[model samples]
Each structure stands twice: as structure tokens, then as C-alpha cells.
Target: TGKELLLVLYDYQEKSPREVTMKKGDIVTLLNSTNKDWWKIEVNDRQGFIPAAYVKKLD
Candidate 1:
């Protein structure tokens, strides 16, 4: 399978470096996540980590 995809659910607080401001319905590539309640993702070429509970996997 390819890299996981996810959709942001809300404005989540930054939990890692270069905290990105994700809005509702924002799509991101799940680089690495669920490792420690934090997820590494890529959105618009910017890479950062967010709370795992704030995003849902895409089909």
C-alpha cells in the first residue's frame, strides 16, 4: 500500500516541530503516526507532527 492519507478534523495544537495550522477538511499524507500519540505528516510540502487523535484515515 502507498503512504497513508488522512483528513484533519479541527484546529489541533502543535505537538512537534514546525507546528502547522491544520483546518477542518485539510488533507495530509501520513508519514509516520500513532507512535506516541503524535503523527508526522506532509501538507502543502510542509512536514510536521500533530496529534493522532485529531485526524482520520482516508479510504
Candidate 2:
């Protein structure tokens, strides 16, 4: 069910715990986005939350 593809739109340096830091142009897995602004994603087996706006859905 968590098969949605996402593209990182901007580099995000996580400022707090439980947040994910991502680089621009990275392709990540979109786990879920229960929070409107925060989306749960996975990269390199590390799962955490990132800004939803920082990523875009890929078809």
C-alpha cells in the first residue's frame, strides 16, 4: 500500500528529532501523510517525517 513515489523538491535539514533531512532531487518512498504539512517517507531504510511541500508526488 505504501508504493507512492515522491521527488524531493528542496533540501531540508531536519531541525528536530523524528524529522527527516533530505537533499534536493532525491527520489524517496512516500509512506503516508496523515499530517497535512508533514509526510512520512523512507530513504535508505531510515523512516521519518519530512515536509510535504518539500516533495512532490510522482506518477
Candidate 3:
């Protein structure tokens, strides 16, 4: 099973490493977890992945 994660850009790198410059309120789906520190997510009509620490999950 997988979970849904939201896309949010943080001002500090510690909060979000891969800061999103576009799609401010974008909703990305968490496809899978690569590791304990990383996750695979989809955003902006682009099928790629990003680090879990860089994103915040929406409830």
C-alpha cells in the first residue's frame, strides 16, 4: 500500500531541499518509498521522484 503526499516549497533548504518554483498548490501522489529518507512522487504532470524530507504530506 501507498500514501498520498502534498507538494510544498519551503524557504529554507532544511525544510525543503527540492523547492518547487512552480505549481504552488500542486498535489503529488506518492507512488512508492525508495528508502527511509527518500520517496518517489509525481508532480507538475512530470513523472519523476523527490526526497521525502523535501515534501510535506497532506492530510
Candidate 4:
């Protein structure tokens, strides 16, 4: 379908800025969703909360 899947983080209130240390070509799956706008992604066996905006579906 020529569709690229990317992951991003959604900063709703901008409470605290967290850093995401992920390497290129890393395959992280969506483990769970905090809410309608928040999602939890697992990378390198480590899971963290990232805003929807931070996630970018790659092509």
C-alpha cells in the first residue's frame, strides 16, 4: 500500500520534557495507549511514554 508506519509522541500539557534514546532502524511496537492521544512504545526492550507528535511513521 506504500504506507509507512512511524511512531510519535504527543505532548498534551508539556509537563516534563523527556529524552528518547532510540537508534535508527529500530523496530519498536506499540505496547499500549495511555489514552486517545497518548501511546506507550517499546524500544530495545525498554518501554516509555511518548506523545503522539514525537512519533513519526517512517516510509
Candidate 5:
């Protein structure tokens, strides 16, 4: 599938360096979604993981 754009729905703290903290209304580009619980994304050129439930796919 093509890379997806997403909208962060909640604020979250990063659990590790591999994960990124996201703020509500932040726009991110989805890089990987193979992990149902934690999806990889890019924000401000920083690539990291975030909870799947924290973001919504954008049309």
C-alpha cells in the first residue's frame, strides 16, 4: 500500500528513542503499520513509533 498520512488524536510520551512523542492535531506520515499496536511514522523528519490508537488515517 501507499504511504499514508495521519492525524494524531492525542498527546503521548515516547517510551523509547525509537518512539516519538506526539501532540494532538499533529500531522504525520505513516511509514509502517505492520505492528498493530505500534506503527512507525515520520514527524518533522524524525522517524519513530507511536501507538496505532493515537492516530487516525487521513483521506
Candidate 6:
């Protein structure tokens, strides 16, 4: 499956191109992260790009 798990360690808002807006302690669906820098994630009802460092695999 392409689905991946992610967890927000801190607040992030449009930090990059098409970045996702999320707050600390938020769990989201990782739609894409093969860029090695940017990540496409969907949280709640919003989906956008975000820094790969912002979230890591939730164990």
C-alpha cells in the first residue's frame, strides 16, 4: 500500500510549496514523500505539501 503514517512534532503552516497546514500532535495520511524534501499529507479535510522533517513515521 502507498499509505504511510505520520505525526506532527510541531506547528507548521505553508513552510514550502503546496505545504500542508498542521499543528503539533496531529496525525495525517502521507499521500507522498518521495521528494526527499517535501511531503504531501492529508489531515482532517486539508491536503498539501509539507517538510519531510516535520513529521516522522509514528513508530
lDDT of all the models against the reference? 0.82, 0.88, 0.57, 0.52, 0.92, 0.84
Local lDDT at 53 for model 3: 65
lDDT of 5 by residue, 1-59 (tens): 87889999999889998999889999999999999999999888688999999999997
TM-score of each: 0.78, 0.87, 0.52, 0.45, 0.88, 0.83
TM-score: which is higher, 1 or 3? 1
Any runs in candidate 3 off by more than 4 Å, and if so which? 1-3, 11-25
lDDT (10s digit) by residue, model 4, range 1-59:
53234544433233444424444455556655555665566665566655655666554
Candidate achieving higher TM-score, 4 or 5: 5
lDDT (10s digit) by residue, model 1, range 1-59: 89988999987756556666677799899998758787888888688888788889997
| lDDT of candidate 2 at residue 22, scale 0 to 100 | 87
Q: Write the per-residue lDDT of candidate 2 for residues 1-59, one digit (tens) a residue.
A: 55898999999988788988888999999888789999999876678999898999998
User: In candidate 3, what are the lDDT values of residues 10-36, reduced to their tens digit?
Assistant: 322223544323244566777676577
How does model 5 score by TM-score?
A: 0.88
Instruction: Give the residue spans of candidate 5 off by over 4 A.
Output: none
- On TM-score, the leading prediction is 5
What CA RMSD would you report for each candidate? Answer: 2.0, 1.3, 5.4, 6.8, 1.5, 1.9
TM-score of 4: 0.45
Local error of candidate 6 at residue 51 (angstroms): 0.5
Clashing pairs in 2: none
Better of 2 and 6 by TM-score: 2
lDDT of 5 at 36: 94
